[PDB]
């Protein structure tokens, strides 16, 4: 219900998971940081359930 | 009712008179009694082998 939101990437507390329950990346060795950009129709995307 | 509470209060005030008993006035929520940092302090960071 809003259109004013921010995306915050904190290099402390990087928890890998869909629900943030997983291993934590070690910030002391990172090679690249690539954002994953796709469309709404990417691979049965929007309306699957 | 006959005011048993009033009699108890008057008797306690009369029987212990002649001495001063003052409890301490410390407030234990003043942030002087908490570990400095929140979750962001390095105490909560993951330890690396």
UniProtKB/Swiss-Prot annotation, chain A:
Range of residues in the leader sequence: none
Coiled-coil spans in chain: none
Compartments where located: Virion
Lineage top rank: taxon: Viruses
Quaternary data: Interacts with host NfrA receptor; this interaction is essential for viral adsorption to the host.
Physiological role: Assembles to form the non-contractile sheath that surrounds the tail tube. Allows viral attachment to the host by binding the bacterial outer membrane protein NfrA.
Other comments on record: It is uncommon for short-tailed phages to have a tail tube inside a non-contractile sheath.
Name the UniProt record assigns to this protein: Non-contractile tail sheath
Organism of this sequence: Enterobacteria phage N4 (Bacteriophage N4)
Gene that produces this protein: 65
Coverage span on the entire protein: 199 to 247 of 1382
